[PDB]
Amino acid sequence: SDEINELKEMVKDEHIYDKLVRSIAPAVFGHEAVKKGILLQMLGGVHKSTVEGIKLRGDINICVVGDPSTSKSQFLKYVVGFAPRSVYTSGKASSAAGLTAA
Amino acid sequence: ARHSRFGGLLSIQTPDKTRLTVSGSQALVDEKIALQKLDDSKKWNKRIIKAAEG
């Protein structure tokens, strides 16, 4: 009941969207655009298919490019530390078998 | 205290200078146990006799 009350209270707020964007990755200064992108990926779109039986992809893929000391790995560290279903992998120290199945 | 393969060996000498051999680490210190353990190895027991039914 108290969980429902708290959830209803924050659902009712006028400024909920801005607060949600502001609450992603608290330690990183600025870069609101990436934080907004991370939130939308975390929520995701709607999966669906047509009468023909073909499927339409319901989810979002993101890539971050940057020169050094730009703190770009902190976003990956936050995501893998927060999202319930997630895994962290380094492109150098991994194999096709270890990435898909072996 | 120490494990089952650490164990040394003990020799016990009687009067008339004859000697016996027993193993295990507690036998080194406890003669009562060594004397009891010595006889316990021996195979035979005399077989035995035995009143109500129905």
Binding site: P26, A27, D67, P68, S69, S71, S73, Q74, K77, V87, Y88, T89, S90, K92, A93, S94, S95, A97, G98, L99, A102 | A1, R2, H3, S4, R5, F6, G7, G8, L9, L10, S11, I12, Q13, T14, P15, R19, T21, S23, G24, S25, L28, V29, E31, A34, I48
Partner: protein
């Protein structure tokens, strides 16, 4: 008169060994050992008259602990045990057992004679064990011969790997199938003494008892793989290894890469030809059965440390003392000292953890003595590794699939310093592995059948020579160094060292190096006042454990100002964090609990000095050699 107990094949009587060790244990006092030592002048009359082992036994009772150390030289000091010392080496299994049952009885005697409150049942329940050590000269692993079997031995070496704990049975449990009578049986010599018939009087039946596995009693066993130290290997050959069996208390003590000295009986056993039959082979297996392990505080130590920390010339004293025979290179020595102390480790509830470790790169001309400095750091550090660029693969440097996972250099070096030499020879493929480990201090792996992340709190000390192999003043500094920017950005300090000709410098250097050949085994050393390596190690270790500096508001203002100064003109955001970390390392070295303005300014000054910034053309990036 009466029957006697004799160690098999010796005519040694157990009564004498028992009584002699009892007398030694209840009347030895430390002064005797000092009589055997070089001078009576050493003796502290107040302390050294005390009954050392009675004091130890009182502590064992009141701390609730079960094992007693014993260095064997004390058996030679007391007259009644001079022969017991030899008998210990020649007959360890019997003599050690005698010592155990002596100690337990003495502990009981103390509480019943001094009529103390402690539970007699508790002391009767416990096992007490002696652990002898410092037995004699160490023995080379290849020089153990078949005349050493079942005698005590001492070995030095390095630990490769440890198997998981194995359950070893000690008591068997039987239950009667028909009448449910039960018996507990003692295991000796590896053989279960199963009863012929059920022992209950009215159920005297054959084949009637049976074993119940999970109601037996077991004990822990583990096997450790020890490797020969390079000091002993024959000419033109590769090191060997020997296996150690270890039990109970000592089981999980030691990790891969540890360096130890041990003490134990050297044993041998047969092995079967096949698992079906009693047929044995003529060659026997050999191993070591350890009873003690050693790694290779007082108010006086604290007084010495606090008194040394009050000296005015402390920073220069410590720096010139890490590598005494190396001439000048003071800034390099200072930077290495601060790497030894390190920053502070930080962990938040959220927002992650921040590394305390410092990474250093030494770059410059040949013959400048870079590799000689890496030798000192490799021997000073408690844990660490030295390696070469052409000697290292990506797998070997981090971790190896073998289905089991195995450790590489950066993992063995955890919490220590990893020295890498000829850094400019390894390929871009191998160097790319270091990005993640340096930034995060973790190693992520995802390969067939294994996926995980491991911790690597490892400090890197690197050595390289520029492109063209001698520093070219017609190229800018970044082009001479030639590491790519994502990797060059990860070092806290980068040093340029240059082979500049100067008659003043050259006469001093020549006099210094030639003075080493005026003696056969030199006593000469570069400076009048340096600290011994042991005490210096004590200082650094204590300061790492007890001291944890914090940022002061004044330090915060100076750091912001200094960063904006270097930035406004290239300084990256990492220059700020490395400055914070260097300032923290400087604060520990003075045993302060706070970072102050002085520490921040020293951190800034050392960064500017290392990369020759004052001599750098601010626009072209070339260095004026005349200003060096």
């Amino acid at each position: 008169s009466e029957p006697l107990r004799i160690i098999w094949g010796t005519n040694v009587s157990i009564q004498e060994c028992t009584t002699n060790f009892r007398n030694f244990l209840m009347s030895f006092k430390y002064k005797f050992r000092k009589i055997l030592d070089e001078r009576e002048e050493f003796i502290n009359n107040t302390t050294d008259e005390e009954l050392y082992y009675i004091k130890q036994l009182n502590e064992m009772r009141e701390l609730g602990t079960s094992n007693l150390n014993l260095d064997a030289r004390n058996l030679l000091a007391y007259k009644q045990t001079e022969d017991l010392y030899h008998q210990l080496l020649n007959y360890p299994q019997e003599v050690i057992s005698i010592m155990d049952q002596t100690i337990k009885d003495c502990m009981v005697s103390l509480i019943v004679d001094n009529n103390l409150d402690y539970d007699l049942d508790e002391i009767e329940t416990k096992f007490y064990k002696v652990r002898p050590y410092n037995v004699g000269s160490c023995k080379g692993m290849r020089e153990l011969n078949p005349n050493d079997i079942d005698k005590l031995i001492n070995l030095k070496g390095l630990v490769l790997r440890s198997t998981p704990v194995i359950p070893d049975m000690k008591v068997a449990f039987f239950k009667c199938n028909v009448c449910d009578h039960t018996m507990a049986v003692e295991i000796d010599r590896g053989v279960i003494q199963e009863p012929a018939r059920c022992e209950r009087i009215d159920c005297n039946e054959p084949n009637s008892m049976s074993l119940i596995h999970n109601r037996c009693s077991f004990a822990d066993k583990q096997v450790i793989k020890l490797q020969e130290t390079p000091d002993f290997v024959p000419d033109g050959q590769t090191p060997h290894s020997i296996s150690l069996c270890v039990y109970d208390e000592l089981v999980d003590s030691c990790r891969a890469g540890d360096r130890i000295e041990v003490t134990g009986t050297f044993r041998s056993i047969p092995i079967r030809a096949n698992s079906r039959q009693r047929v044995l082979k003529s060659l026997y297996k050999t191993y070591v059965d350890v009873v003690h392990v050693k790694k290779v505080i007082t108010d006086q130590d604290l007084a010495k440390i606090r008194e040394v920390a009050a000296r005015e010339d402390l920073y220069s004293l410590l720096a010139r003392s890490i590598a005494p025979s190396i001439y000048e290179l003071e800034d390099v020595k200072k930077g290495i000292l601060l790497q030894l102390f390190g920053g502070t480790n930080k962990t938040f509830t959220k927002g992650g953890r921040y590394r305390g470790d410092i990474n250093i790169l030494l770059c410059g001309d040949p013959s400048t003595s870079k590799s000689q400095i890496l030798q000192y750091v490799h021997k000073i550090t408690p844990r660490g590794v030295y390696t070469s660029g052409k000697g290292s693969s990506a797998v070997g440097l981090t971790a190896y699939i073998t289905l089991v996972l195995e450790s590489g250099a950066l993992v063995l070096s955890d919490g220590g310093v990893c020295c890498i030499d000829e850094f400019d020879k390894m390929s871009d493929s191998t160097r790319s592995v270091l990005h993640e480990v340096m930034e995060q201090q973790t190693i992520s792996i995802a390969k067939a059948g294994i996926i995980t992340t491991l911790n690597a709190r490892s400090s890197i000390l690197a050595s390289a020579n520029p492109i063209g192999s001698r520093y070219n003043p017609n190229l800018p500094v970044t082009e001479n160094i030639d590491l790519p920017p994502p990797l060059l950005s990860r070092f806290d300090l980068v040093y340029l060292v240059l082979d500049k000709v100067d008659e003043k410098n050259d006469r001093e250097l020549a006099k210094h190096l030639t003075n080493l050949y005026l003696e056969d085994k030199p006593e000469h050393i570069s400076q009048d006042d340096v600290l011994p390596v042991e005490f210096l190690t004590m200082y650094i270790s204590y300061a790492k454990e007890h001291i944890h500096p914090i940022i002061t508001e004044a330090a915060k203002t100076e750091l912001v100002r200094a960063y904006v100064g270097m930035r406004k003109m290239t300084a990256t955001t990492r220059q700020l964090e490395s400055m914070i970390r260097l300032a923290e390392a400087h604060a520990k070295m003075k045993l302060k609990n706070v970072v102050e303005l002085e520490d921040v300014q020293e951190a800034v000054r050392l960064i500017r000095s290392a990369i020759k910034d004052y001599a750098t053309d601010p626009k072209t990036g070339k260095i004026d050699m005349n200003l060096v």
